[model samples]
Target: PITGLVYDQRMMLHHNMWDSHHPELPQRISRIFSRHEELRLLSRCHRIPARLATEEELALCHSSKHISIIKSSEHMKPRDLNRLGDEYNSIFISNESYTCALLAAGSCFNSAQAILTGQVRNAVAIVRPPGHAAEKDTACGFCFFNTAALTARYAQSITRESLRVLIVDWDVHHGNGTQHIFEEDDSVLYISLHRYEDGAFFPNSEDANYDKVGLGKGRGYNVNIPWNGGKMGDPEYMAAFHHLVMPIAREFAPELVLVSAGFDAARGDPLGGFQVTPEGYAHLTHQLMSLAAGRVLIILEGGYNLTSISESMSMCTSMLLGDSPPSLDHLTPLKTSATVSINNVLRAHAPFWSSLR
Candidate 1:
């Protein structure tokens, strides 16, 4: 099966403005291109060309006031940008960043459309200025727009389907902004399995605690499974799925699934202290595909280290295409047992599912 892929060259340019360490534009481009090369060799999937999203499309998930803030601050002083929010620090607004964010958001829409139209079974958007951090009126954590959320909302409008969208955020850090956007919408289910660093992390909202279910009709829709500091191997993640996510997702019965697919959780990444090997992520993708009738759209979120990011992407893409998952016999088991966590999540969410049943 030729999985559809979408990306933009302008994504390379955004890296220059966002990342401060490298300072060289060519190196950032090389980092992304190298990942593309690895993915090509790992899986011979078809790539789809796409354009930037229009302002109208962006409005689907972001507030108009926030949009105005981003547009008006193009040449503002550093202090002016700082006052807007810490989020602006990650977004260096050149004409190029603005243009590329539109393109990245558009690429997400294109990938989703391809899956909905039956043009492809699965698709991936290798976009950048990653968008899991952008919320209703603020941008943070290296994201300017919520591409995956925007795509999910667009699909709901066009198809007039049930629009039960499940977001499985496996990024190393919590997707606070994404969670904030859809926290109250029952139609969208956001589940995050992130590293819990005692509130020291960016966008540090409550990690997958038992008490933090959704409010109003959105109750029981949001799920969090934050792992403590330790190695979370394949078995641990699989156990989490079987216990926490799969049962709830089955009850939710989403028409589509969107992954804020961040590879920063992979082993050896600077940001992530957990040990989720490439093979483990492949298995995660495989299990998610089992839901939603195999309709899955993966949008890039965060992954800083070059080698781990590329290899993890390769593993995830391969599994998304139904390829054999990488072997995991040699790796150590995850530290915290998922048994208690799973049972607690299930018990906490049982009432919601009982109502549906």
Candidate 2:
């Protein structure tokens, strides 16, 4: 069985002129792909070409008005585009922004199709303008389209079965857009482990807390393992998986798994102040590979530090290729704060998952 790799040079076109120092640089994906090349990991996998997401595909998660808004940006002047960037937080629009966003979403579409059809055993997509923060009608947090959300919806749409999906978002920031998009649906099980800082993190909202499980038919399908402070490393993350995530996920028994892979929780990230290492990401990916018959798809989301994201992405790619994770030392007991977060999540979800109980 082969792991699928998805990348495109053109995705490096969306960047901001006003802030040359923006963390969401084109190099995010380019550098990750470069690292893959250096390690010769690219050769170990089947490469999948990225394509433009059709309006119908984009409509899977985004509203038509939102699609029109992004489509019109391609023809807008730089000044107008810059002005439009102000309308959304942490976003900048170049002429290629719309196209690049489509490519990013479409990349996931292709990856999902490849995985579902057994063209590949598993896959990783290193395209970006991280989409976990983008909503149905708005673009924010440097995202124009909810790539993972669209992938899940697209996967379900094409399958003859119910196609239950598990979206594991390990981005340091909460995947609010993903949770919001699937909050009312049960077919997609959304889980995120992020820095909460008691709702003081970016896109601050109580909804990111552990208590906001899904609503109505989607109740208990959404999971948020909100960390209160930073410096959360391998132990904290592994504990969450062992105690909270894995139990519920096993019960859900999804047909497909998608990862909103972000490395900002990586040790040196300026914005995410946590301390997750590249090895941590690799081990995490290794764990996810256990489910959905190893039909795991990793799509890039957030991660600002170039070296950090690059290393993390490479390790994750290596893990997806069935490479064993390196030895981790001093994976000490979880911090009291981390334990508190995990316990809260378990309690909140115990009513739904017998595995947790």
Candidate 3:
């Protein structure tokens, strides 16, 4: 059942009149959980408070400089916010930046704890000012702290024994920050399926390329399924899941799975530039459920389309609570682009994973 949900009123406090126009509204989380409540989805789950995190927890994923910058936002005037926003690439600051970020990151940890303690079969954290885009020392793309990264690290730190974390990021924009944070650590496997199109998408770094993989001991732990073009849908996603994501993660054999739950990949979103229905997202969630002893944490990441986000969040909690997902429509063959992309990913990681070999 859905054991946890993270919602806080403070997340709605911050908006922008900065370098970027949208400022990635707090309504991302509001609209999602509001509809979830309207659907009576909370009946199947327990509410987890969106408490603030300890400094130790914050340090687990962020640099002190980054923390200070976020904390200092409380003193900034609007002019200062816009100045800092212009300094970075699409980064915005608000008066409550640090406070909202703490709650967002804390809720992610609360979700993970619920799953790890056998209190919930699956948990969902709908936090705003999404964190996947924040790096070790800087913020970008509306993220201030890497929530998934911190949760995975917190899980690792608290466990008495070895723990493996699989972070599955299905956002349309690559979680370049999350991947960077975990790139050198073997304990966490970071997999992302994003709109790369050869570095044309947001956070257009060479890092999202399939061959980038991971460095040092963490080699092969990073997987990228970059879509070269748009209009990619259910079939393309399922094909990648079956062919690439499933096999690799099974071989890694993680004890927990954390999803960077971004619904921007859903059809009709302005930033996502693609098409994948909420039903398709449900199927993806269903497949991941088979792993980690059915323990999963779905953390909010990116999705601006109010309608699609609501539908996706509804289906996610519905499936987590044991409702049969609506049947997927007739699926098509794999796109040649996705097929080639998967092949390249396997080849690049062949040296590190016997599954690929």
Candidate 4:
């Protein structure tokens, strides 16, 4: 069960306005970058040096117009850079933005490439300037390109048979970009569990709610479990996995599971505003391992709280390495609100998947 790790020095170069006191600092990734060593998860992984994604691969999921905008921004004057930042949905850009973005997308590609080629049982790509928030043309939520979408597309191109990809976006905020990218394709299944609050959340869209499903052939392929609000804990997240996500994934029989692995939903994360713990993330990671025979690629997303991100990420890496999950609190019933949402999801997709029945 050797896990492939995708990391590059360029990851640190991509950042927003982070002074010495900015909550999101160099430590955003450096902390977890150091943890696998402290937690011993690093020793078990096959470190794959990251490469730059070609313009061709970027085009697989993004438009040439969008790519041109990103590439040209690297040359923008500071004044215009800041202007474009405000203009492009609040995404800042530096000279290295394009370069760092290439590495981030490539970091994900390396992990997926290894898994797709049977080089690793599972893998995790820890790169920066997360992507799920990025749409086809606009960069939202500090994201520039959609990593999981690109990887899945590349993977499908290499396979002879239809390669079904199960994209599990557990970020606290909905991954609208990912949902829309594969909304019309049945080969890719995008399931997101995020805080909706009735579209009151940041990067909010009315379609992020649970019933959006998919369109045409992709109908039922897009599954969203919108947390009516926040403070959703392990039980709530796990119940969705148990009753909805896992059952559907098992039925879909994906060839690979790509997780938009954002730990912001973990408790104590100032930005996460939820109550899930490290063990909580580990459980979902383990359940995903049961799919595709442990072939999963975890693409890094959001998680501002360093300590929680480090802890949750370490637990997930350990599970990927075939280690036992930490002892979590005993299993119990789902909360009242979680139970209702779980049932609602089943009924909504019952027409599509037999497992829901």
Give lDDT tens digits, candidate 1, residues 163-245.
78999888877787777788788999999877765455655666446556777888888887766545665677777776677
Candidate topping TM-score: 2
Give per-residue CA lDDT, model 2, range 1-357, as digits (tens): 799999999999998978878888988999999999999999999999999999999898999999999899998998999998999977899999999999999999999999999899999999977899999999988999999999998998889436899999999999989999999889999999999999789879898999999999999999999999547999999889889888889999999999999889999998899899899899899989899999999999999899899989999999999887766654587788998899899889999889976
How well does candidate 3 match the true structure in TM-score terms?
0.96
TM-score versus the correct structure, for each prediction = 0.88, 0.98, 0.96, 0.96
lDDT of 2 at 28: 90
Q: Model 1: what TM-score?
A: 0.88
Quote the positional error of residue 315 for candidate 2 in Å: 0.8
Residue-level lDDT of model 3, residues 181-200, one tens digit each, is: 98988999999999898998
**Residues 110-142 of candidate 4: C-alpha lDDT, one tens digit per residue:** 788888888888998878878898888878887
List residue ranges in candidate 3 displaced over 4 A: 18-23, 329-331
TM-score of 4: 0.96
For all predictions, the C-alpha RMSD in Å is 3.2, 1.2, 1.7, 1.6
Instruction: For model 3, state the Cα shift of residue 144 in Å.
Output: 0.8
lDDT values of the candidates? 0.73, 0.91, 0.84, 0.84
Model 2 lDDT, full chain set: 0.91
Q: Quick one: ranking by TM-score, best first?
A: 2, 4, 3, 1
Q: What is the lDDT of candidate 3?
A: 0.84
- List runs of model 4 lying over 4 Å from the truth: 17-24, 327-331
- What shift in Å separates residue 334 of candidate 4 from its native position after superposition? 3.1
Clashing pairs in 1: 52-102, 52-103, 53-102
How well does model 1 score by local distance difference test? 0.73
